[PDB]
Each structure stands twice: as C-alpha cells, then as structure tokens.
Amino acid sequence: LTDEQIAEFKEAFSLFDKDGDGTITTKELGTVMRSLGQNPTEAELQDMINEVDADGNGTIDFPEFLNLMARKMKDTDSEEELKEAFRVFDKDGNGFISAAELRHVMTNLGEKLTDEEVDEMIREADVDGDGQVNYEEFVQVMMAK
Template sequence: TIDFPEFLSLMARKMKDTDTEEELIEAFKVFDRDGNGFISAAELRHVMTNLGEKLTDEEVDEMIREADVDGDGQINYEEFVRMMMAK
C-alpha cells in the first residue's frame, strides 16, 4: 500500500520538472477525466491504477481527505496545486 506522503513524493518525482502553471493544468486534466473541474475519488483511483498503484477505497478516500481543503469530498484545481507544491 501507499500512504499519502509516499503518494506526494511519487507524484513529485514524476513531476519534478513540472512547476509551470501550464504543466500543472495539464496534470490536473489527466486526473479530472470528466473535465468538471474536480478530481473525484473514482478519478484519482483510475489514474493511480494506471500508474501501477493498486489502492483500496480507504486509501483513495484518505488521499482525497488529505488534499481536500474545503471538505467537499473532491479535489479542485487550487487544492491540487497546493498538494503538488507541498512536496
């Protein structure tokens, strides 16, 4: 299993050259598969699975909770940027 700090460092490694606004927007779009401006638990699980990380529902929910500043159960762009910059 992977915990949230490990997830962040994994993402930071994959994106260590990704600090421009443009690249962050592109990365967000990869997660936000339906384009609604939010990353849901299902979208996060899908991307993590594609990255080779098999996560339980609990792990995905925990990752959402860690990044979800406004408590709406999903990750918006601002929360995503904050999460990615927290590396």
C-alpha cells in the first residue's frame, strides 16, 4: 500500500466517524448500516467491532480500520466481497445500479454528490450502453486505479 491508498481509506473511515473524534462507536456503525438499509442489533454491532478491536477499547480507530481494509484476500473471497458490496448499491436488486440508486447510497453515507456528478459516474462506468451499471462494470470502477 501507499500514501494515496491510506488517504483514500481515511476518507472512507470518515463516513463512519461522524463526530471526527477518530474512532467508530457501535452507534456510529449502526447509523451507517441503517443508512444503507440494514437493521443491526446492539449485540451484532459489538461483535462486528470486536472482530478488529485489538486494543479492547470498544471502538474501531483508524489503525484498526486500515488493518481490516489492507488485508489481502483470495480471489474467491474478493469476488464474493465485491458482489456483496454491489448488492448494497443495487437497492432494488434487479442486477443493475442506476444513477438514482448510486446517488441515494452515496448521499446517505455522507458523501456530497450532484445529479450531474452521478450522471457522469454512470456514463463512464456504462460499458454495454444500457444506461446502468451491472456487476462486472461495477468491478471495473472499484478496481480502477
């Protein structure tokens, strides 16, 4: 890994760390998951944090988050991870991410995105010309640089 990737993950981290205190609490993780359409319980949230809570302080700090994201998985594992991520963006589950779905998820997470911005994103990613983003098209954007 390198600086650019670290800075990128730090921004990803900020989507969870709503108060900017440098740690992700179960409440913050819950807020993000609920914005994605999930409904995790307190127990489930504590278990998730416990998976990477090396210092036992009950929260995920950036070093812990970075370690989680830097971990290299097998191709098979990576493929299933990407598919799971795709399903989160593909709100209606029709196998395609629309501009409406993409903007909604991104905005709910904490990202600022205009219609023209999302239009451009979909356009660039749309390889087959159907106006939407399917799984493999999604993989290309995720792996791009």
